[PDB]
Curated annotation (Swiss-Prot), chains A, C, D, E, F, H:
It is found in: Cytoplasm. PROSITE patterns: TRANSALDOLASE_1, TRANSALDOLASE_2. HAMAP family: Transaldolase_3b (MF_00494). It is an enzyme of class 2 (transferase). Its EC number is 2.2.1.2. The keyword Transferase applies. NCBIfam families: fsa_talC_mipB. Belongs to the transaldolase family. Type 3B subfamily. The active site is at 86 (schiff-base intermediate with substrate). Transaldolase is important for the balance of metabolites in the pentose-phosphate pathway. This is Probable transaldolase. Its main location: cytoplasm. The gene is tal. Pathway: Carbohydrate degradation; pentose phosphate pathway; D-glyceraldehyde 3-phosphate and beta-D-fructose 6-phosphate from D-ribose 5-phosphate and D-xylulose 5-phosphate (non-oxidative stage): step 2/3.
Amino acid sequence: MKIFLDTANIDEIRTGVNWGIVDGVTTNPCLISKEAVNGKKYGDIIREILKIVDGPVSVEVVSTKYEGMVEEARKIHGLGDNAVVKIPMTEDGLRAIKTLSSEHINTNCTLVFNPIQALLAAKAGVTYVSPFVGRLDDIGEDGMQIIDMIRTIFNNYIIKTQILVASIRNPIHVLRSAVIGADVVTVPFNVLKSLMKHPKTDEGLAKFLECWKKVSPD
Amino acid sequence: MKIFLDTANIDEIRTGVNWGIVDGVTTNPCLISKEAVNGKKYGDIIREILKIVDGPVSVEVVSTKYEGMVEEARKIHGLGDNAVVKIPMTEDGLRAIKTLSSEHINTNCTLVFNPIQALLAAKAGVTYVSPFVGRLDDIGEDGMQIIDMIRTIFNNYIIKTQILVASIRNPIHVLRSAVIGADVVTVPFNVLKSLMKHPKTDEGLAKFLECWKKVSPDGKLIL
Amino acid sequence: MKIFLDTANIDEIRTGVNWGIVDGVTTNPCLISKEAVNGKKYGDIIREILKIVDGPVSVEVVSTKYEGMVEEARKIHGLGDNAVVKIPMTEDGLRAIKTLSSEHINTNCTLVFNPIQALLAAKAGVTYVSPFVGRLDDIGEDGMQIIDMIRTIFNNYIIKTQILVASIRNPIHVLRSAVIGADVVTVPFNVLKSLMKHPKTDEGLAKFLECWKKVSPD
Amino acid sequence: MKIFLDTANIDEIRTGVNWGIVDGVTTNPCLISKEAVNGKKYGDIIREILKIVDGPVSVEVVSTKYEGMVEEARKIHGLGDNAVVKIPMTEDGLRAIKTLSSEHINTNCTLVFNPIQALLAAKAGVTYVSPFVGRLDDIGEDGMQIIDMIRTIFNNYIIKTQILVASIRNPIHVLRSAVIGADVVTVPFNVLKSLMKHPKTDEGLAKFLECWKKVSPD
Amino acid sequence: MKIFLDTANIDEIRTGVNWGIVDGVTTNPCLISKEAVNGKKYGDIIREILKIVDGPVSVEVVSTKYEGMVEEARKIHGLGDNAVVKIPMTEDGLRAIKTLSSEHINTNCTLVFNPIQALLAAKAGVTYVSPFVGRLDDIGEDGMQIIDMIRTIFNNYIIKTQILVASIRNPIHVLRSAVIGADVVTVPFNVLKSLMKHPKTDEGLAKFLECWKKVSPD
Amino acid sequence: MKIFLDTANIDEIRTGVNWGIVDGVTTNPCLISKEAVNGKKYGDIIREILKIVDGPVSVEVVSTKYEGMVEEARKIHGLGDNAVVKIPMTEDGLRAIKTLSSEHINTNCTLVFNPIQALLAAKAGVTYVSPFVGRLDDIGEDGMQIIDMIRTIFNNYIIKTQILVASIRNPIHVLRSAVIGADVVTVPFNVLKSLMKHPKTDEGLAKFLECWKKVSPD
Amino acid sequence: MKIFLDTANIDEIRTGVNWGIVDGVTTNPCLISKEAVNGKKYGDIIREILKIVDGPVSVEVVSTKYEGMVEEARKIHGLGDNAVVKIPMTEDGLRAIKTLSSEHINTNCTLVFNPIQALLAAKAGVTYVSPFVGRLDDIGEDGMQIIDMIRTIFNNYIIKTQILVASIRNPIHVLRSAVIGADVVTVPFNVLKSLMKHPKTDEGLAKFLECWKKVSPDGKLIL
Amino acid sequence: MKIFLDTANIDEIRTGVNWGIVDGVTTNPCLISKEAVNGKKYGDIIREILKIVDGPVSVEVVSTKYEGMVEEARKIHGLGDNAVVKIPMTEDGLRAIKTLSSEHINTNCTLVFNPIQALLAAKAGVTYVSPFVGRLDDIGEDGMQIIDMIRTIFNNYIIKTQILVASIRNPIHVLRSAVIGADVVTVPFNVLKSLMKHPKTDEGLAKFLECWKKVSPD
Ligand SMILES: *[C@@H](CO)[C@@H](O)[C@H](O)[C@H](O)COP(=O)(O)O
Ligand SMILES: *[C@@H](CO)[C@@H](O)[C@H](O)[C@H](O)COP(=O)(O)O
Ligand SMILES: *[C@@H](CO)[C@@H](O)[C@H](O)[C@H](O)COP(=O)(O)O
Ligand SMILES: *[C@@H](CO)[C@@H](O)[C@H](O)[C@H](O)COP(=O)(O)O
Ligand SMILES: *[C@@H](CO)[C@@H](O)[C@H](O)[C@H](O)COP(=O)(O)O
Ligand SMILES: *[C@@H](CO)[C@@H](O)[C@H](O)[C@H](O)COP(=O)(O)O
Ligand SMILES: *[C@@H](CO)[C@@H](O)[C@H](O)[C@H](O)COP(=O)(O)O
Ligand SMILES: *[C@@H](CO)[C@@H](O)[C@H](O)[C@H](O)COP(=O)(O)O
């Protein structure tokens, strides 16, 4: 399972890349605008991320119409071979995904909330589909059940689109995604750092070091 | 399923190897410090186990920092080709696993208590991952459930890291590991010995002896 | 299922009580210390909550020894008949719960992380037991499975201790708690506020407004 | 399981009432506005339905604020003892439901789309809660699953609010509601009439007729 | 589980009655037209079955309109208190059932092919509902699955209508009906006779006899 | 679960009764004829068993016709109040069971090989029904599955006939019968004596006695 | 579910009773002989436990014959009303249970390894039956499965004999017993102590202490 | 699935081999001692079986020490290429199996009672492993569950050791072994003889004979 970082914060990205467990990054207009303060410009933020991250970096178009989306997507593609163009699940978005797929521009269909939406994005040729589990949780539906159905559907038809679990809120979204077999999770930094930790690990380290000090003063 | 002995006791290790049922050994600093009493050096204990065991022998680093771990790991690797470097599930541990993996030094990520820790260790390229079932049992969760989920996750992604069930306390840990499909169990010597035994085996053996005396007073098979 | 509010924030409590959907309140030392800032004393915060809320209000002892816990518990009990004494799952805490229960002082055993701890709390006579699901989620274990087991154990022995699901982080903790049959959930305010909402509720109201305006322009 | 008709069409109600299979009626602002054309007035439609239906008749308030909802509810109540006041799942609606319940005015909480909304409606004392299965179907989630969860939740807490499955589109919604154990279904007239029919019933009737003509030509 | 005989043949009924395993009889226009030949009139056939059979005997109306069904049902009723009036699942049939139920005339709704039809008949007050499992098998649907759903539905609502499995073709319809818990099965004579038989029963009697000859040649 | 002894051997019966775990005895013509050798007569064998056993003793009739079976059954009844008359699953046997049931003579229907046969015996009023699990095993059908279905069927209709598992061959027939909830098992002597035994019991006894000898020389 | 302490150590027993979490005690001849060292008589150990424990205390007979068992059982019964006579699953044991049952002496059938043994003990009228889960674990079968079947069998027949899970080795035996619905578990002291503990409890306690020092330097609750 | 005959009785072996349904033979010291009576020597019995049976013939060592087992095994191997050396699951037995396997002498590990013992035997390189189901049944544990677990374990690791189900007592052991997928069953002669038979086979043949006699009196 690939693990991406769901942030535009340079420091978090830099920190997680230095850990060796971050395989890419996803952004969206709100994540970027959070960092585009104190004079920093959205374009610098994106270019800086594309540089630090050797894996896929997803960058969302802001136009809502087919022609604007394809033009922004070509501009995004031109920023680096690892850029992935994030495109909403809309009629124009599906059209743009199909056109960009033929141009060999990698794409990520976002704002997906049910399995048939995910299937339509895959049929348009999208590289990744991003169902938003946390926002389903917010409205009282277990979001992970949609991941499970998408995994079954994609397996049924040998679909090559990667399931990219997004809107992740806690380490159990991550656990369940791996158990289901989703291809990718993207996680906020606070979640990423928790995934390595467990109280019994720390307890165990402490006890092992005490045994070592019985045989080695240094 | 491979079966490793989880001890640093040399008499136990020779005895188990002699049965032909031990495929390797795991140690940790507490297991080693138990045997390093009355003049026995830790380094001699490690070197002796490496000598008598043909299979993998896991030896744990004691540094907690990335640099100390990789330096110590290269030294452990240098002691014999069957040495496997045991490294804890920490941020520095994962970085060390990735570096050592690329240097073709076999690694065993230890102190793992949930399936996502295990997956992270796999992603860093570790040779073996060791979830501690008995210590999960101690805190009131069925540790074998974590083995089951790890096996499913590894199957999903065709992960080559071997699942090495550790902190084994009883033969049902072993039975459930085999049914799940864990690659390896590491067991204390007391557990190892019990795996061979069953009261009906003893009983059947005595009955076959009694039957054979009816046909051969000296109990031999003359063919 | 009763729904408690898991905060010491007086404004949040007043709002949720005014919504009519809050059956009680849980606090803990960290929640209280968050509010006891810039002159506001912790004793005033506790008393104000007890006054506002008609339902049970859980207030945690701070001593770690049997004698200290019981003494603090009686002071807590004396603040109001709706006070419930929150006591940690420890050896002294069990002894304290047994004494307070024999004194007909309602108790709430907290910091519970597995079903056997919850059972021990029930055997000491505790009124409520509070397993922490979100903290279990944090360490890579699905906390709700512990609630499911506790419900089964409690059903097996006709246990009268109420299961109070705590450390709740999202509305699916709440949903799964109701499907399991937990007696109480205690929820932070941002979770509480989301429980009434659904985008199809908002949409349906807007469509109903359009139809009514056709037969009544006023 | 009670079966209500989901229409404001007086001919459909008369027809289905004359069948003896209709236990009540649900309306909503859009259903009424469809029939309030060519001089027909919403007040007369409502009064005529109340007159013809012995059982419960659900009439929805149009105000969105607590005080207007309660005042409308009392006027709806005054129109007949069989009237049930339909109130949306909103903060103000929950407040209205609680006030009307205490006044022994029967209520029906509408625009419910998940099981926790339904529980909050029951906790306010609502007589009926109406989850909208077809509108869930429309957005790619199997709406009957929410009915199943509500049934389990209500059973767990011995909740007396009746489950009134609404937004019904086909006879399988009806069948699944009956197998789950929902208290009430409300159905459009075209669904209602199909519930009695089956090709093998028609075929069997013709066969028995032919056999009867061999013994009695007349 | 009660067991009825599904035939109008007098010698079959008399034979099954002599065995003590027949609790009632069902007929229909075709079963009656098969025996009403060579000078035998349908009126004598019905009266003669009523006389032999102590328990319920179902006799079908031939009218297809409400008034005729109701008038015919009264004539059937007057023939004997064990007579049960069989009425088809139609609009007029439900109306007739409800009228006859208010007149304390036992009824049996026939030509039922799905569970919701069965529920409608129960709602009209019918004493027995008869789903046709064999005719569903004929069209490629496992008819026993309809019995299972009807059992669940009736259990859910504590429905007093008895499930009468009809159109039985083999002993496994009987086995499955009893495992499900259907109230009654009605069986053709060739099925009824087979129910008592098993080749290991025959073989066991032979062996027991052989042993008895050794100890007692008499 | 009651445990009966399936034998006519006086010594086995005497031995098992002296153990306190034998609640009754079942016989059949072959079991009796095995003991009716060296001059011993079948009548003495039966009378001797009726004397040693305070629980039900089943004694099979040898006639195959209704009138002979009832006359033999009345003779068997006259031998003692604990006698149970065993009667094969046949048309005449069912008739005899119904007649004897009215006379308050306890009966046991034997040679039952499927669940519908068991149901028919229960409908005739039989006290016990004896399905033969071992003889189904012999012909390649798991006999315990028939016990399971009979238990479900009898539970469904609150049937008071006791399920008496017969043709028992091993302790797993016994285990599965108890897990299913059969009322009675009847077991051959070699099976009965094995039920108390386990190697770990003997191993445990030996180890406990060695500890006792460390604190007590005697 | 009741929780008994499976020991004859008086310090353990007083300590557990003091927690208020021990509802009774089980002993056996090996547990008692462990404490009858350096002058301590077995009879004084039994009498002391009977004195300090308010709940049931199971004390095992040492005779293997029916007559010896009932005589010894009447003496055990006479030592206090909370004494429960522990009797092995044997032919003589079942006869002894039936006699003692009719004399209103509470009994605990021990050394049970399968569900039908348990049912036979119930049929003889025993108060408690003690299946040994840990010793089934030792021979490679999941002993908790036997508890589950016994619970089902007892439920089927409304049997009043209490299921007393014994030979408990870890907290998962306890957890699974509670989920199954066993009436009683008897546990060694080490297991008992672990049941109260969890690392997240410790961690949460330390964090609540730290929060409270921000509002009260002396860490007290002044109300 | 191969079917072996579990006996040393030469007449039974000749008969089963003549039936063409016997793929091999297993023996053990008790089975051989049963036949080696009244002058017949055990060495002649073994040699005669090896001659008659074309398939594998399992012959158990009698020594309990490694050196003795290996020496006896080579003498066994030398009697015929179809000899298989049966070795008990003991510490020395595992060592012996490992040595013999490296010498390409086929082995059969016996007295296996749980799945881990079977796994240990496979790891020593044994050709066949023989779990004893009937002896497990004897002690109140369903022996077939051990076969099910061994199959799963062996499948997990692609183990080439054949599962040879032994201590078989009835045809349902055989049926369940085939459904599980065990490689071999070894059966006593009275079990083997029953596997071909079924009362409906006999009945069907008799009916077919009657029909043929109508078109052909000869
Ligand atoms: C792009 C698609 O993978 C991501 O940046 C998504 O927008 C976020 O994962 C959405 O998460 P929130 O629901 O927390 O905004
Ligand atoms: C190394 C990991 O393979 C092993 O030595 C583990 O440290 C032990 O298995 C841990 O067991 P304990 O919980 O008994 O220390
Ligand atoms: C008291 C117990 O009901 C509560 O205040 C709990 O301490 C909190 O629910 C714990 O939540 P966090 O894990 O978010 O502190
Ligand atoms: C009232 C609630 O019982 C009903 O009139 C509902 O508004 C309708 O059932 C909703 O149906 P549509 O989704 O077809 O509007
Ligand atoms: C009346 C309903 O109980 C019955 O006589 C049914 O008409 C028959 O059972 C139908 O059987 P066929 O499908 O074989 O006509
Ligand atoms: C009477 C009915 O319970 C019993 O004696 C049965 O005849 C035997 O249990 C039959 O067993 P076999 O199949 O072994 O004869
Ligand atoms: C009596 C039965 O309740 C107990 O003392 C049992 O003997 C022990 O629980 C057995 O445990 P071990 O297997 O550890 O001896
Ligand atoms: C050799 C192993 O395949 C066989 O002869 C076994 O020993 C027997 O199958 C064991 O059967 P019993 O339990 O009936 O002795």
